[PDB]
Design a protein around this ligand. Structure first.
Ligand code: APR
Ligand code: ZN
Lengths: 97, 425
């Protein structure tokens, strides 16, 4: 999987998280705000948002003009029926029907 | 001048609807609340989303509901029933099993496009064409099938034809690593991919037409047939992202020569050989194994030694520099995106769809839906039909021979879903 190379598009970090959570958790039976937020936010890639910039990509610059060669966006946006979570498609239109 | 109002959410009121508490009913959530959440996430970032939608003090049970709030259902059976009955409340294990799945959920939304609520229809697309000064068009193999050239992935396609000569992955035929080890694999089928001469479809002329009206920002093609240039598309407007047969290159000495010079050799299924490497090659391959006893070939010499290769882009190879230079100046500056006749399976080209600004409308013209992309509007059917139909509705003239016959031809547009239309005749 070389960067910027033609490729047919169609994990130690995982256990790193399980380790990293169980550590900050085990000594406490009452979790905190800043605790759990910071516990979530470290499993989420760097990203920008529409207020900070209107030119933000549809993947939130997780795949952008600068990083597209290393883009992990294809990986996150694919959650197969095999996967744990089930994804509910939600689309609303403004219509005169 | 942010046009992202359509994508801006309404700041909801306070933390989520929970704070034994509601074991069966639960703080239920509605599609508008969920979709508004997804919008909120993508609008303000993950941080703000986390801060606002959560109480100033909490437990581990919100972690499950943030998942339901974003419109996800956790499929883990033992976990469900535990939650149904129960109400820190949660175990240590499950609490981790939760935090993970929330991160996946957040990442899936952050990495997923949200369709524009105000662009769902054929008329929208038409009206947009009139107002658009920068149009980015991405064409695949489909735009050429009407000329007899089969596409790659259809049941009638290239990969199927060679799958019947045998191979595990017919795509290996275009693999770069394999070419270096065994150039014979590619050259066996190479004649099949040789471009025809001086022809183009109506759809090519449609892109030609957009260029004449000054509305065409760039045309990115994955096609190596070079038909684009014949239809009149200019060198500055055209990018062949996958290379072209225009030239070929020795993979050892890096010499470069006019592509036509190897066309006969390819028609005859002979290895095209570099004149300048032919000296040393003959020592390693005395017997003339070049066609469709290796004892004299040392471990540091592969079969591709002294072999020419066409400048088209193999899998695992690097795309032309022009691609990278162009995308960097193009993606941000573009007000419309149309995809024509491509399954969108092959990166980085496919990632154009993921790297574009959020307000930019995305339109798909193809015989099949692209399921892994969120397209505002998808017209399903033959791209020549669909081109004629659209050109009519703009009161436009396609500069093609087959126009005079097509301009009167009538097409039926049947809506199968919102933003989805089946165009026929
Ligand atoms: N006349 C047509 N009109 C509209 N769509 C068409 C038409 N003909 C075929 N199609 C559609 O075009 C798509 C075909 O594209 P692919 O066969 O997948 O090839 P493409 O996406 O253009 O390129 C992928 C890349 O893979 C590489 O191996 C190869 O170099 C190619 O550039 C299919 O979804 C098919 O439904
Ligand atoms: Zn050479």
């Amino acid at each position: 999987t070389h960067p910027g190379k033609m490729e047919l598009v169609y994990r130690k970090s995982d256990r790193e998280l399980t380790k990293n959570i169980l550590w900050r958790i085990a000594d406490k039976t009452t979790y905190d705000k800043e605790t759990i937020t910071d516990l979530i936010e470290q499993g989420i890639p760097k990203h920008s948002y529409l207020s900070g910039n209107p030119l933000t990509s549809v993947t939130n610059d997780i795949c952008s003009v600068e990083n597209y060669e290393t883009s992990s966006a294809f990986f996150y946006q694919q959650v197969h029926k095999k996967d744990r979570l089930q994804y509910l498609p939600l689309y609303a239109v403004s219509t005169f029907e | 001048s942010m046009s992202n109002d359509v994508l801006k959410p309404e700041t909801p009121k306070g933390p989520i609807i929970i704070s034994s508490n509601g074991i069966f009913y639960g703080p239920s959530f509605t599609k508008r609340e969920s979709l508004n959440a997804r919008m909120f996430l993508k609008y303000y970032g993950a941080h703000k989303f986390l801060d606002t939608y959560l109480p100033e003090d909490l437990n581990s049970l919100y972690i499950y509901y943030l998942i339901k709030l974003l419109g996800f259902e956790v499929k883990d059976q033992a976990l469900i029933g535990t939650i149904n009955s129960i109400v820190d409340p949660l175990a240590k294990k499950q609490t981790v099993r939760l935090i993970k799945d929330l991160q996946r959920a957040i990442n899936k939304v952050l990495c997923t496009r949200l369709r524009l609520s105000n662009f769902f229809t054929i008329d929208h697309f038409i009206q947009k064409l009139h107002t658009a000064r920068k149009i980015l068009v991405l064409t695949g193999a489909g735009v050429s099938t009407s000329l007899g050239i089969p596409d790659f992935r259809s049941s009638e396609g290239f990969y199927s034809k060679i799958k019947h000569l045998g191979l595990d992955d017919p795509q290996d035929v275009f693999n770069y690593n394999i070419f270096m080890h065994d150039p014979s694999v590619f050259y066996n089928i190479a004649n099949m991919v040789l471009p025809p001469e001086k022809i183009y479809s109506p759809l090519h002329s449609f892109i030609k037409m957009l260029q004449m009206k000054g509305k065409l920002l760039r045309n990115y093609t994955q096609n190596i047939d070079n038909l684009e240039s014949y239809a009149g598309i200019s060198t500055d407007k055209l990018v062949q992202c996958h290379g072209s047969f225009a030239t070929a290159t020795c993979v050892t000495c890096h010499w470069n020569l006019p592509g036509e010079r190897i066309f006969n050799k390819i028609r005859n299924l002979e290895l095209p050989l570099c004149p300048y490497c032919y000296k040393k090659r003959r020592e390693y391959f005395p017997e003339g194994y070049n066609n469709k006893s290796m004892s004299e070939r040392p471990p540091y010499i592969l079969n591709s030694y002294g072999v020419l290769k066409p400048d088209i882009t193999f899998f695992g190879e690097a795309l032309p520099n022009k691609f990278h230079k162009s995308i960097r100046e193009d993606i941000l500056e573009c007000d419309l995106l149309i995809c024509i006749g491509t399954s969108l399976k092959v990166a980085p080209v496919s990632e154009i769809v993921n790297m574009v600004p959020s307000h930019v409308p995305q339109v798909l013209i193809n015989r099949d839906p692209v399921k892994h992309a969120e397209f505002d509007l998808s017209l399903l059917g033959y791209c020549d039909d669909i081109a004629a139909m659209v050109a009519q509705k703009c009161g436009w003239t396609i500069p093609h021979k087959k126009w005079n016959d097509l301009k009167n031809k009538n097409f039926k547009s049947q809506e199968k879903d919102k933003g989805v239309y089946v165009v026929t005749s």
